[PDB]
């Protein structure tokens, strides 16, 4: 993993771009690892980390979501890629377009024969000023559902202690969609959109924390 945690390689921190779609039997996390993108947290970080470790793959398939109505690909100076302002490779920061953020109601069927792992997030801006500024309305709201699950999140506007000069935060969530099931995203703001899904496998893979060098 070198400088990257599993979660950071997943999300697509620019310095972890080399990790895209790679597989492992054993992923090794170094104590020296650090994030250098937009500051984030993961509710139940340990479980997501765990399920990915066990799946043993970063294979990602891009999908064409219908984000008509909004501006896609929002970026930040806290997340530099090739010397320019960027964002997580696998995530899509949506903002208003022409001062509207229409309520999004976007669908994505799993018509595959395998499960899809979707990684998405909610942005918690540091001020109301940022709120109006990003989403052109005072309060965003996100509902992510399948036939067999639902995850509803209310953005929390407010300052957090600055991380790499950033007082705002993103909260990360995940959703598995079985074949025959459907991903539904209903949002009115603050959605950090997935660009697709990760494939999820089962097998002998795991993760270990260690600072021992790799030998031939």
């Amino acid at each position, epitope marked *: 993993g070198e400088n990257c945690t599993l979660i950071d390689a997943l999300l697509g921190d620019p310095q972890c771009d080399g990790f895209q779609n790679k597989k492992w039997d054993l992923f090794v996390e170094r104590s020296k690892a650090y994030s250098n993108c937009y500051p984030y947290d993961v509710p139940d970080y340990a479980s997501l980390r765990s399920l990915v470790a066990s799946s043993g793959t970063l294979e990602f398939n891009n999908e064409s979501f219908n984000w008509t109505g909004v*501006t*896609q*690909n*929002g*970026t*930040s*100076s*806290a997340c530099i890629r090739r010397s320019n*302002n*960027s*964002f997580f490779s696998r995530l899509n*920061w949506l*903002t208003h377009l*022409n*001062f509207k953020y229409p309520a999004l109601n976007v669908t994505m069927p799993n018509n595959e024969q395998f499960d899809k792992l979707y990684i998405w997030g909610v942005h918690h801006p540091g001020t109301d000023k*940022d709120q109006i*500024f*990003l989403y052109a309305q005072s309060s965003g709201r996100i509902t992510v559902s399948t036939k067999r699950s639902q995850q509803a999140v209310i953005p929390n506007i407010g300052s957090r202690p600055r991380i790499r000069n*950033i007082p*705002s935060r993103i909260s990360i969530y995940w959703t598995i969609v079985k074949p025959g099931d459907i991903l539904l995203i209903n949002s009115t703001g603050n959605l950090i959109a997935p660009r697709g899904y990760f494939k999820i496998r089962s097998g002998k893979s795991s993760i270990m924390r260690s600072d021992a060098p790799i030998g031939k």
Partner: antibody, heavy 131, light 111 residues
Framework: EVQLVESGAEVKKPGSSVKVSCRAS???????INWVRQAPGQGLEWMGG????????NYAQKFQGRLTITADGSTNTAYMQLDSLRSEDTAVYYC?????????????????????????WGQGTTVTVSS | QSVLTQPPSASGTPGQSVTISCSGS????????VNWYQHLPGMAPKLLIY???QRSSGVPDRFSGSKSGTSASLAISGLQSEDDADYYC???????????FGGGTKLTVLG
């Protein structure tokens, strides 16, 4: 892509205030709208700019306290207001911005990052300051 | 004194070439891209060069921009009568927190 059209030529007595408008043919919100003037026999002079998407304004020191720039997104119109006018304020006033687009727009950056080379220009507004 | 220093004048005859220099400081040219403008009597300026060495849409490749250290240059070859104009450099200045222009160079094309 967008075209910029300014209000007509103006004349003001010393000590008064002038306001010039700058209407774009469509949304022009993401990048800095700059204001630049030319007095007769003088070089181009940067006065200031605003990055409308943020409302953030940057002003030249020479004009701080007497220049105010506004951007009203709802009508796609920008404005320059210069108070306490003197003879030195006689100039052609242009508004301008970039036709820049990006696959990905920055949401929390320093003001300088939204200022680019100006390839979209208004037709200019003649302002005369005289008693 | 403009923050960027340009010679007041430059000249050549048709088909010749010229280079116009633009000098600044660490706070401006050293850490920022350079823009170059052409200004003809009566009309708004037109952008020729941005990001120090990239040509604006429709501009022929006989206009070229460069920058190194704390100075920038606009070079013009194959001189034609219509290139006669005032030329301005510009960039962001990190100390003033704003854009600064050079004083301009009056280029004469002796057609």
């Amino acid at each position: 892509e967008v075209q910029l059209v300014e209000s007509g030529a103006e004349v003001k007595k010393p000590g008064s205030s002038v306001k010039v408008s700058c209407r774009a043919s469509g949304t022009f919100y993401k990048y800095a709208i700059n204001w630049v003037r030319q007095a007769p026999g003088q070089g181009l002079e940067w006065m200031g700019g605003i990055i409308p998407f943020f409302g953030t304004t940057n002003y030249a020191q020479k004009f701080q306290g007497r220049l105010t720039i506004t951007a009203d997104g709802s009508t796609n119109t920008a404005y320059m207001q210069l108070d306490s006018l003197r003879s030195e304020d006689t100039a052609v006033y242009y508004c301008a911005g970039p036709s820049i687009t990006e696959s990905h727009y920055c949401l929390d950056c320093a003001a300088k990052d939204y200022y680019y080379g100006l390839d979209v220009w208004g037709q200019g507004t003649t302002v005369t300051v005289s008693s | 004194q403009s923050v960027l220093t340009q010679p007041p004048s430059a000249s050549g005859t048709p088909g010749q070439s010229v280079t116009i220099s633009c000098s600044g400081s660490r706070s401006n040219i050293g850490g920022n891209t350079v823009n170059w403008y052409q200004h003809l009597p009566g009309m708004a300026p037109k952008l020729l060069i941005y990001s120090s060495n990239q040509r604006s849409s429709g501009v022929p490749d006989r206009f070229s921009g460069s920058k190194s250290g704390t100075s920038a240059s606009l070079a013009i070859s194959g001189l034609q009568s219509e290139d006669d104009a005032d030329y301005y450099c510009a960039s962001w200045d990190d100390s003033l927190n704003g854009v600064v222009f050079g004083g301009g160079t009056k280029l004469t094309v002796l057609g």
